[PDB]
Amino acid sequence: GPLGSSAGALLAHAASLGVRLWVEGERLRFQAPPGVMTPELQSRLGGARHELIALLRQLQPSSQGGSLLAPVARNGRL
Amino acid sequence: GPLGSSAGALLAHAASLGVRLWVEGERLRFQAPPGVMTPELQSRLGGARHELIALLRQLQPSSQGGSLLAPVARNGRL
């Protein structure tokens, strides 16, 4: 598989697989497809706050104004 | 008939599969074997405090005196 540098690779593969962890009230809810949640992957996740916060940031549907960038210039040459 | 509140099946299968969730400092750590963490099983867990506390209770190696029952060296109620 791809190793990458570190953060971007982790962020990319976690978002792509759809590993979302969010705290809801008293209990943390985990979104993990069958097979990807292998113990070593969890070690890749690291269980750290900053990236996990970004993992929810992927799902954020709240649309509280500052939701996503929305550049609109997605094309224009490439 | 179904009584409710008391979920022996939930406790048994969660312990058997080795599903453990514990809050460590800031971050809840999840122990989930690949394949068993299917979303519907998470729904079976319910994500509630009481049963999950028991899910840690199975792992408790702290040996703080009141660890387990140990029905050995004593014949029932003596």
Short mmCIF file of all heavy atoms in Angstrom, two decimals, chain A residues 26-30 32 34-35 37-39 42 47 49 52, chain B residues 26-30 32 34-35 37-38 46-49 52:
data_model
loop_
_atom_site.label_atom_id
_atom_site.label_comp_id
_atom_site.label_asym_id
_atom_site.label_seq_id
_atom_site.Cartn_x
_atom_site.Cartn_y
_atom_site.Cartn_z
N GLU A 26 -22.26 11.46 26.23
CA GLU A 26 -21.42 10.69 27.12
C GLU A 26 -20.58 9.68 26.35
O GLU A 26 -19.54 9.22 26.84
CB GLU A 26 -22.28 9.94 28.15
CG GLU A 26 -23.29 9.01 27.52
CD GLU A 26 -23.75 7.92 28.46
OE1 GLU A 26 -24.63 8.19 29.31
OE2 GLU A 26 -23.24 6.79 28.35
N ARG A 27 -21.02 9.32 25.15
CA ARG A 27 -20.40 8.21 24.45
C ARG A 27 -19.84 8.62 23.10
O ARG A 27 -20.47 9.35 22.34
CB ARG A 27 -21.39 7.07 24.25
CG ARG A 27 -20.72 5.72 24.07
CD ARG A 27 -19.83 5.42 25.27
NE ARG A 27 -20.53 5.67 26.53
CZ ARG A 27 -19.93 5.74 27.72
NH1 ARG A 27 -18.63 5.49 27.83
NH2 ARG A 27 -20.64 6.07 28.79
N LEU A 28 -18.64 8.14 22.82
CA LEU A 28 -18.02 8.34 21.54
C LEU A 28 -18.59 7.34 20.53
O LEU A 28 -18.66 6.15 20.81
CB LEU A 28 -16.50 8.18 21.68
CG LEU A 28 -15.66 8.48 20.42
CD1 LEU A 28 -14.27 8.95 20.82
CD2 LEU A 28 -15.56 7.24 19.54
N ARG A 29 -19.02 7.84 19.39
CA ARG A 29 -19.55 7.00 18.34
C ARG A 29 -18.48 6.76 17.28
O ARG A 29 -17.77 7.69 16.89
CB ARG A 29 -20.79 7.63 17.71
CG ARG A 29 -22.10 7.22 18.35
CD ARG A 29 -22.22 7.68 19.79
NE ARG A 29 -23.45 7.21 20.42
CZ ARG A 29 -23.94 7.68 21.56
NH1 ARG A 29 -23.32 8.65 22.21
NH2 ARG A 29 -25.06 7.18 22.06
N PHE A 30 -18.38 5.53 16.83
CA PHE A 30 -17.34 5.14 15.90
C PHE A 30 -17.98 4.66 14.59
O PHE A 30 -18.91 3.85 14.60
CB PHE A 30 -16.51 4.01 16.53
CG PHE A 30 -15.08 3.92 16.06
CD1 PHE A 30 -14.08 3.65 16.97
CD2 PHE A 30 -14.74 4.06 14.72
CE1 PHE A 30 -12.76 3.53 16.57
CE2 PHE A 30 -13.43 3.93 14.31
CZ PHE A 30 -12.44 3.67 15.24
N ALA A 32 -16.86 2.71 11.36
CA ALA A 32 -15.79 1.91 10.81
C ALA A 32 -16.33 0.75 9.99
O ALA A 32 -16.98 -0.15 10.52
CB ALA A 32 -14.91 1.40 11.93
N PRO A 34 -16.45 -2.76 7.89
CA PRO A 34 -15.93 -4.07 8.24
C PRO A 34 -14.64 -4.40 7.50
O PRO A 34 -14.59 -4.34 6.27
CB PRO A 34 -17.06 -5.04 7.84
CG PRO A 34 -17.88 -4.28 6.85
CD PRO A 34 -17.75 -2.83 7.21
N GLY A 35 -13.59 -4.71 8.25
CA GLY A 35 -12.34 -5.10 7.64
C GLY A 35 -11.27 -4.04 7.76
O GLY A 35 -10.09 -4.36 7.91
N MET A 37 -11.08 -1.76 10.14
CA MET A 37 -10.85 -1.43 11.55
C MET A 37 -9.85 -2.40 12.19
O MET A 37 -9.84 -2.59 13.40
CB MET A 37 -12.17 -1.39 12.31
CG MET A 37 -12.05 -0.77 13.70
SD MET A 37 -10.85 0.58 13.78
CE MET A 37 -11.43 1.67 12.49
N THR A 38 -9.03 -3.03 11.36
CA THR A 38 -7.98 -3.91 11.85
C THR A 38 -7.11 -3.19 12.88
O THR A 38 -6.84 -2.00 12.72
CB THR A 38 -7.10 -4.39 10.68
OG1 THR A 38 -6.81 -3.28 9.81
CG2 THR A 38 -7.79 -5.49 9.89
N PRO A 39 -6.68 -3.89 13.94
CA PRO A 39 -5.94 -3.29 15.06
C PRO A 39 -4.75 -2.43 14.62
O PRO A 39 -4.43 -1.43 15.27
CB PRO A 39 -5.45 -4.51 15.84
CG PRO A 39 -6.47 -5.56 15.57
CD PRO A 39 -6.91 -5.34 14.14
N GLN A 42 -5.99 1.00 13.46
CA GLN A 42 -6.29 1.79 14.63
C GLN A 42 -5.01 2.42 15.18
O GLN A 42 -5.02 3.56 15.65
CB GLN A 42 -6.97 0.93 15.69
CG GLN A 42 -7.30 1.70 16.94
CD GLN A 42 -8.36 2.76 16.70
OE1 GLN A 42 -9.26 2.59 15.89
NE2 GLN A 42 -8.22 3.89 17.37
N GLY A 47 -5.25 7.46 17.51
CA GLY A 47 -6.17 7.82 18.57
C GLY A 47 -5.89 9.20 19.13
O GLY A 47 -6.06 9.44 20.32
N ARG A 49 -6.35 13.49 19.06
CA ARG A 49 -7.47 14.41 18.95
C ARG A 49 -7.49 15.21 17.64
O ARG A 49 -8.51 15.26 16.96
CB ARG A 49 -7.45 15.37 20.14
CG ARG A 49 -6.16 16.15 20.28
CD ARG A 49 -5.97 16.63 21.71
NE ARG A 49 -6.95 17.65 22.09
CZ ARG A 49 -7.45 17.79 23.32
NH1 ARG A 49 -7.09 16.96 24.29
NH2 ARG A 49 -8.33 18.76 23.57
N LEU A 52 -8.51 13.42 14.48
CA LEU A 52 -9.86 12.91 14.65
C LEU A 52 -10.86 14.03 14.53
O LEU A 52 -11.91 13.86 13.92
CB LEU A 52 -10.02 12.17 15.98
CG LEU A 52 -9.30 10.82 16.06
CD1 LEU A 52 -9.61 10.13 17.38
CD2 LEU A 52 -9.69 9.92 14.89
N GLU B 26 -8.47 11.85 27.64
CA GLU B 26 -9.28 12.70 26.78
C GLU B 26 -10.01 11.88 25.72
O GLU B 26 -11.05 12.29 25.21
CB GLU B 26 -8.38 13.72 26.07
CG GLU B 26 -7.29 13.07 25.23
CD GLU B 26 -6.77 13.97 24.14
OE1 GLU B 26 -7.43 14.07 23.08
OE2 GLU B 26 -5.71 14.60 24.34
N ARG B 27 -9.45 10.72 25.39
CA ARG B 27 -9.89 9.99 24.22
C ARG B 27 -10.36 8.59 24.58
O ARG B 27 -9.67 7.86 25.30
CB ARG B 27 -8.74 9.93 23.21
CG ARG B 27 -9.17 9.77 21.77
CD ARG B 27 -10.17 10.85 21.36
NE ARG B 27 -9.68 12.18 21.70
CZ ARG B 27 -10.45 13.26 21.77
NH1 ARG B 27 -11.73 13.20 21.43
NH2 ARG B 27 -9.92 14.41 22.17
N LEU B 28 -11.53 8.24 24.10
CA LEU B 28 -12.07 6.91 24.29
C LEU B 28 -11.38 5.94 23.34
O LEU B 28 -11.31 6.18 22.13
CB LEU B 28 -13.59 6.92 24.08
CG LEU B 28 -14.33 5.60 24.36
CD1 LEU B 28 -15.77 5.88 24.75
CD2 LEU B 28 -14.30 4.68 23.15
N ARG B 29 -10.84 4.86 23.88
CA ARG B 29 -10.19 3.84 23.08
C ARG B 29 -11.15 2.70 22.81
O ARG B 29 -11.89 2.27 23.69
CB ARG B 29 -8.93 3.31 23.78
CG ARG B 29 -7.65 4.06 23.43
CD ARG B 29 -7.69 5.51 23.90
NE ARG B 29 -6.48 6.23 23.51
CZ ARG B 29 -6.05 7.36 24.07
NH1 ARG B 29 -6.76 7.93 25.03
NH2 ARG B 29 -4.92 7.91 23.65
N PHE B 30 -11.13 2.21 21.58
CA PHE B 30 -12.06 1.18 21.15
C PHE B 30 -11.29 -0.08 20.76
O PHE B 30 -10.31 0.00 20.01
CB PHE B 30 -12.87 1.70 19.95
CG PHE B 30 -14.22 1.05 19.77
CD1 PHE B 30 -15.33 1.83 19.49
CD2 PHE B 30 -14.37 -0.32 19.86
CE1 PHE B 30 -16.57 1.26 19.30
CE2 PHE B 30 -15.61 -0.90 19.67
CZ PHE B 30 -16.71 -0.11 19.39
N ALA B 32 -12.00 -3.42 18.82
CA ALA B 32 -12.96 -4.09 17.96
C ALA B 32 -12.26 -4.93 16.91
O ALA B 32 -11.59 -4.40 16.02
CB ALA B 32 -13.86 -3.06 17.30
N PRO B 34 -11.70 -7.12 13.54
CA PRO B 34 -12.16 -6.86 12.18
C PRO B 34 -13.35 -7.74 11.80
O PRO B 34 -13.29 -8.96 11.88
CB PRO B 34 -10.94 -7.19 11.32
CG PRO B 34 -10.09 -8.06 12.17
CD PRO B 34 -10.32 -7.63 13.58
N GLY B 35 -14.44 -7.09 11.40
CA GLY B 35 -15.60 -7.83 10.93
C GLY B 35 -16.76 -7.77 11.90
O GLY B 35 -17.92 -7.73 11.49
N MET B 37 -17.32 -5.34 14.03
CA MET B 37 -17.69 -3.95 14.29
C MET B 37 -18.66 -3.42 13.24
O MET B 37 -18.77 -2.22 13.03
CB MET B 37 -16.43 -3.08 14.41
CG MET B 37 -16.70 -1.68 14.96
SD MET B 37 -17.97 -1.67 16.26
CE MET B 37 -17.34 -2.89 17.41
N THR B 38 -19.33 -4.34 12.55
CA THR B 38 -20.39 -3.97 11.61
C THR B 38 -21.39 -3.03 12.29
O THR B 38 -21.78 -3.26 13.43
CB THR B 38 -21.11 -5.23 11.11
OG1 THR B 38 -21.26 -6.17 12.19
CG2 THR B 38 -20.34 -5.88 9.97
N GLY B 46 -25.56 -0.38 21.61
CA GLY B 46 -26.44 0.68 22.08
C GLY B 46 -25.69 1.94 22.44
O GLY B 46 -26.27 3.03 22.45
N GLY B 47 -24.40 1.81 22.72
CA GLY B 47 -23.58 2.96 23.05
C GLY B 47 -23.97 3.59 24.37
O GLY B 47 -23.83 4.80 24.56
N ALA B 48 -24.46 2.77 25.29
CA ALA B 48 -24.88 3.26 26.59
C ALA B 48 -23.82 2.95 27.64
O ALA B 48 -22.99 2.05 27.46
CB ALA B 48 -26.22 2.67 26.98
N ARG B 49 -23.85 3.69 28.73
CA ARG B 49 -22.82 3.63 29.76
C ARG B 49 -22.79 2.31 30.54
O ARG B 49 -21.74 1.69 30.65
CB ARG B 49 -22.99 4.82 30.72
CG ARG B 49 -24.40 4.93 31.29
CD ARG B 49 -24.72 6.36 31.71
NE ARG B 49 -23.81 6.86 32.73
CZ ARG B 49 -23.34 8.11 32.76
NH1 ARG B 49 -23.63 8.95 31.76
NH2 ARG B 49 -22.57 8.51 33.76
N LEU B 52 -21.41 -0.88 28.83
CA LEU B 52 -20.03 -0.65 28.44
C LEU B 52 -19.10 -0.66 29.65
O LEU B 52 -17.98 -1.15 29.56
CB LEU B 52 -19.89 0.66 27.67
CG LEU B 52 -20.53 0.66 26.28
CD1 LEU B 52 -20.27 1.97 25.56
CD2 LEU B 52 -20.01 -0.51 25.45
#
